[PDB]
Symmetry: D3
Subunit: 88 residues, 6 copies
C-alpha cells in the first residue's frame, strides 16, 4: 500500500548529458528505489528512501557536461512502493 516518498526536481543542463543514466547508477550504488524522468522542466527523481546521501553525491559527481542550477524537494505518497530504480 501507501508510503511517504520524496520527489526531487533537478534543473539546469540536465539533458543530453547522461543525466538519467547518472541518476540510475547513483541509485543503484545507494540501493535506492523509485524512478527518474525528464518531463520538460528538468529531471524528476522519486525515491522511497531519504534523499540526503543521493543529493550530496548528485552535486559532487555531476557528469562533466551537466550543470545543476537548482534542486527542489517535496514529499508525496507512493501508491505502491517501488522495488527497483527505473528510468522512465
Amino acid at each position: 500500500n501507501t508510503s511517504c516518498g520524496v520527489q526531487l526536481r533537478i534543473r539546469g543542463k540536465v539533458q543530453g548529458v547522461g543525466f538519467r543514466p547518472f541518476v540510475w547508477q547513483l541509485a543503484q550504488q545507494l540501493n535506492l528505489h523509485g524512478d527518474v524522468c525528464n518531463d520538460g522542466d528538468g529531471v524528476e527523481v522519486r525515491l522511497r528512501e531519504d534523499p540526503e546521501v543521493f543529493l550530496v553525491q548528485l552535486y559532487q559527481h555531476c557528469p562533466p557536461l551537466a550543470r545543476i542550477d537548482s534542486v527542489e524537494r517535496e514529499p508525496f505518497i507512493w501508491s505502491a512502493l517501488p522495488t527497483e530504480f527505473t528510468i522512465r
Copy 2:
C-alpha cells in the same frame, strides 16, 4: 508548504467517553501538532510528528469507558503544517 504527516484511525468504543479530549491532552503532553475528529468511522488523528509514543500511551492510558478495538495508520501530505493540536 507541504510536509509528510500521519493519519491514525482509531475504532472501538471511542465516542461519548471523553476520547477527543483524551487525545487532545495526550497531544499537549507530547508536544504534538495536528487534529482529532470523530467522522462516524471512529476517531481520526492527524499528526505532524511520528506517532509512536502517542500510540503507546493511547493504548495504555485509554479512558476507562473507552475501548480501542483497532488502530490503523497511513501517511498523508499536510497542505500547511499545523501549529497547534485541535479538536475538530
Copy 3:
C-alpha cells in the same frame, strides 16, 4: 543490495494459536516487508522497516489464545531487500 533490518524474537505461547497469520496480517496493515517463522525458540520476525508500531500492536492485539512473555530485538543486514511479507 544490502540494508539495515531488524529481527524480533517473540517468545511465549506463540504456536498453535494463529500467531504467524496474526503477524502476517499486522505486517500487511502496516505495509511492512520481511518474514515470520517459528524456529523452535519462539517466533522470529524480520523487518525492513522500523518495528515500533508493529510492536505496539503485536502486544495490544495478541490473539486470544496467544501470550507474549518476551520480545527481543537486534539489527541485522538484509542481503536483498524483501518486497513482500511472507510466512516461512
Copy 4:
C-alpha cells in the same frame, strides 16, 4: 561533546518494587545508554537513544508489584554521551 537525549519521568508505584533494576535490565537488552534514578517524583530515565521500544516494553513487562500511572517525555542535551546504562 553534546547530543540530543530524552528524559522519561515514570510515576506510579515505582519504588520498593524492583523498578530501577527492571529498567536497567530492559536497557541492557535493548542496548541503551544513560541512567535511571528515583528522585522522589517517580523514576527518571535518561537515554541517548530513541525511547519507543523501551516504552512499549516498560508497560508490557512492568514488574508485578509495580504500577505505572503516567510517563512523560522531554528532550534534553547530554553534556557527554553515556557509554553504559547505570543506576544512580
Copy 5:
C-alpha cells in the same frame, strides 16, 4: 513546549553578501522553521528540522560574493517551537 533543535554556525565571508536573505530563501524552499542571525562570529541558523538538505544546498548554492569557510552544528532545546523562518 520544548523540542530538539539544531544550531548551525556558518563562518567565512558571510556578511554584506546577501547571506541572511539567502538562508531565509533556502529555508522557505525547504519548508524549514527557525531563524537566522549574524551575531559577530558568523551566521547562526537555528532549525526545528534536520539540517542535512539545507547544509548541502547552503554550500552548493552559496551566493557568489559569499564564501563558507566552516560550518559547525550542535543540538539545543527550543523553548517554544518556531512557526515561521525569520531573519533576526
Copy 6:
C-alpha cells in the same frame, strides 16, 4: 551489544595528504564515534551515527592535496559500540 553502523569507502588521492587526521578532526567536531583506516583500497570510515553531515563536510572541506573521486556506503553491524573516534 550490537548496533547498526555505516561503513564509508572513500577513494581518490587520499593518502599522504592528511586524510586520516582530517577525518578524525571532522568526527570530533561532529561528535561521531567509530574509526578510520587506510587498507589499500582507499580510506574506510566506520560510524555509529548517520553519515550525512560528515559526508557533506568531507567533500566541501577536503584537504587541499587530497581529491575525492568516489564514496560508497553500506550498512554493517557493530559488535560493540564505539566510545571514541580513532585512527586505526
